[PDB]
Amino acid sequence: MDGGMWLMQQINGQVARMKSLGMQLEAADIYNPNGSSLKDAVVMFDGGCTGVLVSNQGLLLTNHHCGYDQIQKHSSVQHNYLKDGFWSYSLAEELVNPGLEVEIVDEITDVTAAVKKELERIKKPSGLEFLSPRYLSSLAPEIVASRPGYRYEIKAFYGGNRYYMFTKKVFRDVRLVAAPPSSIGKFGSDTDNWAWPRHTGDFSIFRLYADKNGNPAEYSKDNVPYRPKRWVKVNAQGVKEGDFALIMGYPGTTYKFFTADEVTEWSEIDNNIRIEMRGILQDVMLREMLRRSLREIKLAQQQEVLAWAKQKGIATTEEAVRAISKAIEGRQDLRMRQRYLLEGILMGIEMSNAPAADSDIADHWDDPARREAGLQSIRKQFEAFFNKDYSPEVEKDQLAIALLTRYAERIPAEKQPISIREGIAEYGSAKAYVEMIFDKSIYASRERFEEFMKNPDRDRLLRDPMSRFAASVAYEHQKLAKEVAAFDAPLAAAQRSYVASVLDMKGQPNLAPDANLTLRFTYGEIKGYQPRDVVTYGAKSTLEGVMEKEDPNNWEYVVDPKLKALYEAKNYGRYANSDGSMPVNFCATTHTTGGNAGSPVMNARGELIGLNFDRNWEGVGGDIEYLPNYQRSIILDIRYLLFIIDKFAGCQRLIDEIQPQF
Amino acid sequence: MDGGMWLMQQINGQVARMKSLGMQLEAADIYNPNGSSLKDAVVMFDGGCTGVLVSNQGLLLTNHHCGYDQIQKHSSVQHNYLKDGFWSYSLAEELVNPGLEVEIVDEITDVTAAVKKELERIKKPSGLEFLSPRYLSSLAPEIVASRPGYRYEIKAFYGGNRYYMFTKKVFRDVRLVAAPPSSIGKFGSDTDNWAWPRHTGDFSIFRLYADKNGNPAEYSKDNVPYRPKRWVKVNAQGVKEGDFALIMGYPGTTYKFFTADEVTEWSEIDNNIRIEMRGILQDVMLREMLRRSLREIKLAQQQEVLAWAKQKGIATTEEAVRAISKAIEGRQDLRMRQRYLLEGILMGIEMSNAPAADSDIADHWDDPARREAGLQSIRKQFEAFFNKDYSPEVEKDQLAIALLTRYAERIPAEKQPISIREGIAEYGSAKAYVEMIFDKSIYASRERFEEFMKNPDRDRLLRDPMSRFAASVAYEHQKLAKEVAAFDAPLAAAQRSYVASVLDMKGQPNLAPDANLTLRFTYGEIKGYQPRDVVTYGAKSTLEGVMEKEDPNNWEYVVDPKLKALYEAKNYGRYANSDGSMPVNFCATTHTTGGNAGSPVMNARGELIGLNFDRNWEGVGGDIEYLPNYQRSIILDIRYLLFIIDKFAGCQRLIDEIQPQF
Ligand SMILES: [Ca+2]
Ligand SMILES: [Ca+2]
Ligand SMILES: [Cl-]
Ligand SMILES: [Cl-]
Ligand SMILES: [Cl-]
Ligand SMILES: [Cl-]
């Protein structure tokens, strides 16, 4: 209901409501176009996550998943940071992360008229370039002489009725500072996933580095900690039910302007196929041995705008709705095939991201120095392919067999990827085809890969079954996109017309746009809920809950001996709740989605109160229409984070830098 | 902690505490030795259950399980009362139940000195007759000229330190008045068993009949409704958290005076074997395809009495404790074999209660009229054997195989029942032995039994495999009892000595005796609890909870169309809670156990507020030491009972008789 993800510019038209909920911040304290504000502290981590700066030395807080790749890359047999955690006791002990990028919003500019004028310049348009962030960002040099360490991001808002430009400081020297052990960072990661109550210490600590002047730069020996314009201060006094909660971050995608028919499609195609493919997964895992509906809500909002379009002489609103419905039915087959490919293969079967040999392998194999460069690319691709964070569940060969068999049944042979339809044809079934791949591929195992990398050959790399699988699957993805574009372009144009009417009716200052992975703020209150009859969920969880879930045999519920020793002695310090319990997590009515992972949660005074890392609902259903009655965002208590650093890790250096207030 | 099951005579020494909890009743209103009180309204149903009289025409309320046998006996294909429920719209439509007995306490008398003097009369005693209720009840005619329709019950209290006599009016014309459908009477009977929250309408309605003068009698055409001295009035104003709750009934067995070593034995033998055998059951069901410990608490109480025995010159207390421990270890093997036979075969394998041919079958088969009499006994035994209420779960042949196989592994051949050790020896395994029985037995199926009963033969009945099984299993039971008696008698004597010391220390007026299936009262408050971190259970459940658990495919969760129609229209009447929700169940901190099934739950003013039908904990662990912090008794809301009669059934006759106050 009230889950708006507001633009930073809309702080003025929201500040009144927020102060009545208990906020003591001023509008300029949250966003200031002429000074420092909380904007300069909320960063984009690795492009898909969110982080917060908490010191004058550029200390960065985020989730455990967002920094997983970095923790994994730095992990070994002797020093398993992924399992045991990592704690640097000095600036020099902080681990360098090649490739890792963190962006800070320097300033935001309205370029609506500029972008629109640039779109008219196109001779014969595809019809989707007015929404493509890649195309829109290329129009930036003509608008702004582009400095280094700066990126100019331009994206569509309100379905293409507005265009805002984001000037980004791009830091390319982001180093790993700290990380909790896996038993804490993802306690009950499988069972309690997308679920409240929760008892997970989901965090990881990084730091921004720059030159002597504080400007973004590549890794250098001489680089020093970045000193931000503004960092969020950490509060350790605690939280209470009913408290105001401010969340800033980069929400990925929402669908708040969905026509009733768009909800039907999402339910019948997008959502059903997601649940169907996910069901096969937990079936493969299972062969272990020892009052108002969504469509009704969006239909009411649809009719509300249509009744406003009528009564006023506007016909376009009503033309847009039917134009949308027309495109929906037209792409029914295309959308269905895209979703099965996306839910069944691209996600679910890791083989889709198998390494591909570059031109240096096929060509120039005889050039020794160039050969090793191509082999290095292969090795690099394999490490970023083999075992990701949360996604490896069970036996990969059996999982791929079950998913591909279902895919082959849902999609006819002539509409399958070439590798799949040819493989099934030659080996008989989708099972036998997968079996062959895991039988012959280099990348089927680490020991297989390393055994091959000790005497490589060009042929073998070029004709690898798993590589051909990933390429042909990707090729189909892009064939579908080009073909469904004949329906998506009329859909997009009609959507722009429909949102334009909603904009005319409700006014832009009072209408939050859909999330598009740009900086936004949202607010609510710390509050529990009633999941079912007789049962009430509180807003806060404690360390006692961790001990209740302790199962020495269930690896997701393993409790570290040190953590258990702290619980027995009640050695919590000033981090504990007033009632003497040690806080772990809390939930809030604030709307967050994919991309808000690692978002700072702040006080009524704008002090860091926790880190967002999950929500109690899964699927995108809550992004179509938020339901604050039961839908919550699950947040790591910042006192628990401090507790892990202090009483568990013994890394006093980080406490002294953070300086938690009380 | 405070789960005393007080004698009716102890009402004086408890009334003060109860009134401070909010009770407005006087002591004489609960128990009066010279007048009518709530005592005369709380009846013993079928010997093992409890019932309450709620009208001047002898209307009786109890659970759905307590009257199951009656509902089943009266059920047929055309009129399935077990599934669809039963509702009599007049006195003449009430169904006669042969054999059903209901006892009312006429008066209670202290006969301690009399019984003890009678025990000294025994020449050479076994050592257990001072606890045997059968023996003690035979001493009654010498104490009291015994009228008809009266039974004199004498039992041991405080381990044989007190003896109280109960004069019982025995009604043998108890007729079935009403019963809810199975979908209501046992909604979620499997999953929500021994569990809170709960949404079960567990009840059944009977009525006492008597002669023209109101005296107990066998069934007769001329019998009229019994008019009790005192009946409990039904209150429909509702309940609130914190309200005083009085429960009267007949609790079966508790073990509050257990020595620390007695707790160890119970845990290692009694409880472990119960859980072990129960585990095999849910394993057979699973091959469906598509801060202080108990011993520590009782040790503290043990030492508390021992420290009191010392300091005072008493040595017997300390002699008793070691005497108990001596008997415990002595019967270790005997107790273990008794428990495996009890948990593995007597309960779990229904074959243990297979029909046995009487002397009229073996002898006098040539006498035609006597032959049919024996066949009638066989038929009677089969109906009371074949499919009980809550116990038939799944395939019986596979269940017996799994349990007997485990039994055979735990108990060596020479210590097994003769039928089992000889069957296993001839057929090879416990599986093949069970297979033979279900292959050849008459009683293996209803259709098998009826097919046999159309042309019976003497041999076949006499040598039936299932009959021989039940007899030899029973024979072993009685061989074990006679043999373990050499340890149980010194144990009993030592227990009597130990409780005697506790009696001397705490005083009888302030000490509640262990339950022995006699009339007792207990009290507490209506109150929820915290099962785990972040989760809170309320004290009351609503009809909304039923609809949330609705699963048309899960038979235990089938919701009747009529009940669902009532929920949609909110047709609750004055039965609904103040907030507009329809109450179903509530829980209280009152200690109840097996035998309290159907016990009346009453107001602070002694008005019927609900019926007890379960508790949120299983096993006997709470009967050794009650833990009111989380242990609750689960109670049917009386307003829900009235609602089922009125708005669901349409049996207005019962409402007009009950006359619910407000
Ligand atoms: Ca607090
Ligand atoms: Ca009420
Ligand atoms: Cl293509
Ligand atoms: Cl705690
Ligand atoms: Cl015997
Ligand atoms: Cl309700």
Residue numbers in the entry:
A (entry chain A), B (entry chain A): 21 to 164, 169 to 314, 346 to 717
Reproduce the article's own wording on this structure.
Interestingly, we obtained an unbound PeDPP11 crystal form, called here PeDPP11altconf, which lacks electron density for helix α14, indicating its susceptibility to unfold. Similar to PeDPP11 complexes, this structure is also closed (rotation angle of 27° of helical domain relative to the catalytic domain), illustrating the enzyme flexibility. The helical domain displays a high diversity of structural states across all solved structures in this work.
Here, we show that dipeptidyl peptidase 11 (DPP11), a central metabolic enzyme in these bacteria, undergoes a conformational change upon peptide binding to distinguish substrates from end products. As previously reported, the overall fold of DPP11 comprises a bilobal architecture. The upper helical domain dictates the specificity of the enzyme and caps the catalytic domain, which has a typical chymotrypsin double β-barrel fold. The active site of DPP11 lays in a wide cleft running through the middle of the protein between the catalytic and helical domains, which contributes to the formation of the substrate binding subsites.
